[PDB]
Design an enzyme around this catalytic site. Structure first.
Site, short mmCIF file in Angstrom:
data_model
loop_
_atom_site.label_atom_id
_atom_site.label_comp_id
_atom_site.label_asym_id
_atom_site.label_seq_id
_atom_site.Cartn_x
_atom_site.Cartn_y
_atom_site.Cartn_z
N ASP A 342 96.27 41.72 159.02
CA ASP A 342 95.31 41.92 157.94
C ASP A 342 93.96 42.33 158.50
OD1 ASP A 342 95.05 41.24 154.94
OD2 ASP A 342 93.27 40.27 155.76
N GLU A 371 96.19 46.75 159.54
CA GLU A 371 95.31 47.56 158.71
C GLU A 371 94.14 48.00 159.58
OE1 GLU A 371 94.65 44.56 155.60
OE2 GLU A 371 94.99 46.22 154.19
#
Ligand SMILES: OC[C@H]1O[C@H](O[C@H]2[C@H](O)[C@@H](O)[C@@H](O[C@H]3[C@H](O)[C@@H](O)[C@@H](O)O[C@@H]3CO)O[C@@H]2CO)[C@H](O)[C@@H](O)[C@@H]1O
Ligand SMILES: OC[C@H]1O[C@H](O[C@H]2[C@H](O)[C@@H](O)[C@@H](O[C@H]3[C@H](O)[C@@H](O)[C@@H](O)O[C@@H]3CO)O[C@@H]2CO)[C@H](O)[C@@H](O)[C@@H]1O
Ligand SMILES: OC[C@H]1O[C@H](O[C@H]2[C@H](O)[C@@H](O)[C@@H](O[C@H]3[C@H](O)[C@@H](O)[C@@H](O)O[C@@H]3CO)O[C@@H]2CO)[C@H](O)[C@@H](O)[C@@H]1O
Ligand SMILES: [Ca+2]
Ligand SMILES: [Cl-]
Ligand SMILES: [Cl-]
Ligand SMILES: [Cl-]
Ligand SMILES: [Cl-]
Ligand SMILES: [Cl-]
Ligand SMILES: [Cl-]
Ligand SMILES: [Cl-]
Length: 650
Positions: A342, A371
């Protein structure tokens, strides 16, 4: 939120926790942070260099009063130690520290087991949580990251629909149940997922997230959260266990999940959220060592680049150590096969490369993706582990958002079309993703050095589903036309170089009824709808056949950019189409050449083919009216939106 006291600086020689020189002191290098339990004795070690005193507080029940509090001894490098010469099995504990004039009490940051809602550390022998045969758990083989097919799944979504046919609805154990059946007797759950041919299940947050997200003591009331609010990084989420009050249950049941997935030929990727904590004021980090573990601006407020209130200071040595040791705990204790980071652009490059190096020492097939978005933070730009810095992050995959938007249209302007829905000028964006995001040539380049750095997707838990985005951008279209666009987007993902990534339910055109950000929407929005799945068995079979096509052709799975530049050629093709060949047995392909057409034109087209030999249809024959190979010019007659794949046999 109360008062935060950053310490009596005389404890640390006048060096403030915010001081650059602090990172040079108290760099504990030992492997024993947390509690080490044995019947004979339990040893505790806490890193708390700014505290003037430290105590272990023992509890007999998760909700009770302290039965004992024992002073710890100041030890080396800012740590405190204590060993209790009693059998502490079954007790709970916290640390109490005096920082400045404040007395703070907190769970062990290195907790491996917790009580309900994670408010006390639980002491237990983790060997008693191992399933039978855990010693012989073996991973399915994985020759390349480009050989993965990722299936992104929330543990509650999987089973909570009333017709899922799964007994332990909403739980880890629900994904161990074999032979489950839904409407019309269709396979559901694990059997549905293995039947697709995906290789990795990527689980949304399964670490312990905060009570404010899901109250683990009120599971008899409606509840739902994605779980992006971390509370205890090294212990599973309690609401996914059959008994959140039994500290061993969530651990054993998660291990049973991983063991069963491995036995059925699936690997497991953990979504991990080391970029922030649920509440920067209440988290154990801030109660035990205020000012160290989270990032602060120059004015001593939290840096909030995550938009969640706080950022973890991954670049400071003890937090880098915490994160690495956490990851290694999931690998070693739970046999996890991969991590999806994340907001990875909030993590520093040195930490990410050290994670990758430590994982490579254990098993280089363990996946690392994240990400890699470019986002402001107090962390200097050149240290952010994002797409702009991908050349400094070898072996780490990043979600290719350029490919995603080119295929299905802009995810933030809902009505805007993309390639599949008949928008103009998206061909080169699709081509860039077909090439794995590498520097292929000319304007066909993105951020990847190598195709293992590019994760291709048209749907994930964030933003509208593919179906919902198509509906919002195709006002004039029939549902039949929309389904053809949906199928085309999935086909592009599975025939592009790089790592293909599917959202659970994409195979049956999953809808959220138009909800854009469903993180705390009720189960009616978020469940895997096995009724819809039963009405879309043709589309599920299409996805299964696409996945089988990629498995049969290593030309789609080239491991290096040099191979892609040598074997991939883009061919002349009209607007609203993309056409390419994978030439000369690319990657060991059994066929001599492949030709791939992405056709977003609903009408009739006559296409020139490269004269490479006797082409034959391998996929999408329903769109092919005729195929002429010429002397063996070569021409293809097609109609309708969809993918066509041709091959020249050896
Ligand atoms: O409670 C704090 C925080 O909650 C809400 O933020 C949530 C997002 O709205 C939600 O989409 C999700 O965001 C994460 C993405 O899904 C994830 O893939 C990646 O992009 O990181 C995001 C954060 O980790 O979860 C968060 C946190 O629950 C709310 O919108 C915020 O305003 C609020 O500050
Ligand atoms: O409140 C924070 C924010 O969290 C979530 O937003 C996430 C997006 O949903 C998700 O797509 C991603 O956004 C990135 C784009 O995909 C990417 O192409 C590029 O533009 O960078 C974006 C991030 O800067 O991540 C964000 C941030 O977590 C949630 O959905 C939102 O509702 C919420 O506002
Ligand atoms: O397997 C190779 C084959 O895959 C794809 O065909 C699938 C169809 O697209 C999909 O709709 C479905 O069609 C079958 C139905 O499930 C079945 O009930 C009955 O109607 O027969 C249909 C097959 O004609 O499943 C197939 C197979 O997965 C792809 O479209 C083909 O080009 C490709 O050859
Ligand atoms: Ca929890
Ligand atoms: Cl705590
Ligand atoms: Cl089956
Ligand atoms: Cl539950
Ligand atoms: Cl916060
Ligand atoms: Cl940036
Ligand atoms: Cl890019
Ligand atoms: Cl084939």
């Amino acid at each position: 939120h109360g008062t935060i006291d950053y310490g009596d600086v005389t404890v640390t020689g006048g060096i403030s926790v915010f001081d650059a020189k602090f990172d040079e002191l108290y760099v504990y290098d030992g492997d024993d942070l947390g509690a080490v339990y044995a019947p004979e004795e339990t040893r505790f070690r806490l890193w708390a260099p700014t505290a003037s005193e430290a105590f272990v507080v023992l509890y007999e029940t998760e909700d009770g009063m302290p039965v004992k509090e024992l002073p710890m001894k100041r030890d080396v490098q800012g740590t405190w130690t204590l060993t209790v010469a009693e059998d502490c099995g079954g007790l709970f504990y916290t640390y109490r520290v005096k920082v400045g004039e404040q007395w703070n009490e907190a769970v062990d940051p290195y907790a491996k087991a917790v009580g309900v809602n994670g408010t006390k550390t639980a002491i237990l022998d983790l060997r008693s949580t191992n399933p039978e045969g855990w010693e012989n758990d073996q991973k399915p083989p994985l020759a390349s990251p480009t050989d993965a097919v990722i299936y992104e799944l929330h543990v509650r979504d999987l089973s909570i629909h009333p017709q899922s046919g799964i007994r332990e609805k909403g739980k880890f154990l629900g994904l161990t149940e074999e032979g489950t059946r839904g409407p019309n007797g269709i396979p559901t759950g694990l059997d549905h997922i293995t039947g697709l041919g995906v290789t990795h299940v990527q689980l949304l947050p399964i670490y312990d997230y905060s009570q404010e997200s899901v109250d683990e003591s009120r599971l008899d009331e409606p509840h739902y959260n994605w779980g992006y609010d971390p509370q205890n990084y090294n212990v599973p989420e309690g609401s996914y266990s059959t008994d959140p009050h039994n500290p061993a249950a969530r651990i054993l049941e998660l291990k049973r999940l991983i063991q069963k997935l491995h036995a059925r030929g699936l690997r497991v990727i953990m979504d991990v959220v080391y970029n922030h904590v649920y509440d920067g004021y209440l988290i154990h980090f801030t109660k035990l060592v205020p000012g160290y573990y989270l990032r602060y601006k120059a004015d001593r407020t939290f840096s909030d680049g995550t938009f969640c209130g706080n950022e973890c200071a991954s670049e400071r040595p003890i937090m880098r150590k915490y994160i690495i040791e956490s990851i290694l705990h999931w690998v070693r204790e739970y046999h996890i096969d991969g991590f999806r980071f994340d907001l990875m652009g909030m993590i520093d490059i040195e930490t990410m490369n050290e994670i990758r190096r430590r994982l490579d020492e254990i098993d280089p097939t363990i996946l690392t993706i994240g990400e890699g978005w470019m986002m402001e933070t107090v962390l200097p730009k050149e240290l952010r582990a994002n797409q702009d810095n991908a050349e400094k992050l070898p072996g780490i995959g990043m979600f290719n958002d350029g490919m995603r938007d080119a295929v299905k249209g802009d995810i933030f302007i809902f009505d805007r079309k993309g390639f599949i829905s008949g928008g103009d000028g998206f061909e080169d964006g699709v081509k860039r993703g077909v090439a794995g995001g590498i520097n292929y040539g000319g304007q066909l380049r993105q951020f990847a050095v190598e195709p293992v750095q590019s994760v291709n997707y048209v749907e994930c838990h964030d933003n509208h589903t593919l179906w919902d985005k198509i509906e919002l951008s195709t006002p004039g279209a029939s549902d039949e036309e929309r389904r053809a666009m949906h199928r085309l987007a999935s086909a592009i993902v599975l025939t592009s170089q790089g790592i293909p990534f599917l959202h659970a339910g994409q195979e049956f055109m999953r809808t959220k009824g138009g909800v854009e950000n469903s993180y705390k929407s009720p189960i009616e929005v978020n469940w895997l709808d096995w009724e819809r799945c039963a009405a879309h068995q043709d589309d599920v079979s299409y996805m299964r056949s696409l996945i089988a096509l990629r498995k049969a052709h290593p030309a789609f799975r080239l491991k290096t950019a040099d191979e892609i530049r040598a074997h991939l050629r883009f061919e002349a093709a009209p607007p609203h189409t993309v056409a390419f060949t994978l030439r000369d047995h690319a990657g060991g392909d059994p066929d001599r050449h492949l030709y791939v057409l992405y056709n977003a034109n609903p009408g009739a087209l006559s296409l020139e083919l490269p004269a490479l030999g006797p082409w034959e249809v391998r996929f999408g024959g329903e769109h092919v009216l005729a195929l002429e190979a010429g002397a063996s010019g070569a021409r293809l007659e097609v109609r309708g939106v969809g993918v066509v794949v041709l091959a020249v046999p050896r």
